[PDB]
Nucleic acid binder design. Structure first.
Length: 85
DNA sequence: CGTCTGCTCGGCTCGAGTGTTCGATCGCGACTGAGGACGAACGCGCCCCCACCCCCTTTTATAGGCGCCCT
């Protein structure tokens, strides 16, 4: 860590074979992919509103632009359309 | 006037639903090939019947040979 080194011994190590997947990874540009993209952004926006101390709760746009910098700001504008002014 | 944020609108992409076509076994059906059994006709064998020829005797002349019977 930042403060120093720490040492443990280990005695047990597992080898994991070939995985049998139980969850389907979406494809690129899929409907499930884009749904997750906007849902994740919406959850981050709600949790930034919960963390806000001023009443009424207020956030800044460039916090979201620091978190999601590949997003066009139009997508963020629409996620803020419903729930913020 | 420039920047930024939001709102609307347009275009593109992807997913889902449906309908048509084809094949995927397929589940019967038709139909010909393969295989003894029974009845009728023939030829065919077997049996029976018919036909023909000789044997029963008598006679009579006549004679050589073989066998038997009582004198």
């Amino acid at each position: 860590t930042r403060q120093g080194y720490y040492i443990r011994e280990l005695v047990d190590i597992f080898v994991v074979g070939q995985q049998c997947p139980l969850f389907e990874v979406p494809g690129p540009n899929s409907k499930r992919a884009n749904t997750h993209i906007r849902d994740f952004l919406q959850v981050f926006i709600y949790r930034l509103f919960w963390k806000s101390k001023d009443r009424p709760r207020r956030i800044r746009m460039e916090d979201i632009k620091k978190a999601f910098p590949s997003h066009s700001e139009s997508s963020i504008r629409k996620r803020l359309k419903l729930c913020a002014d």
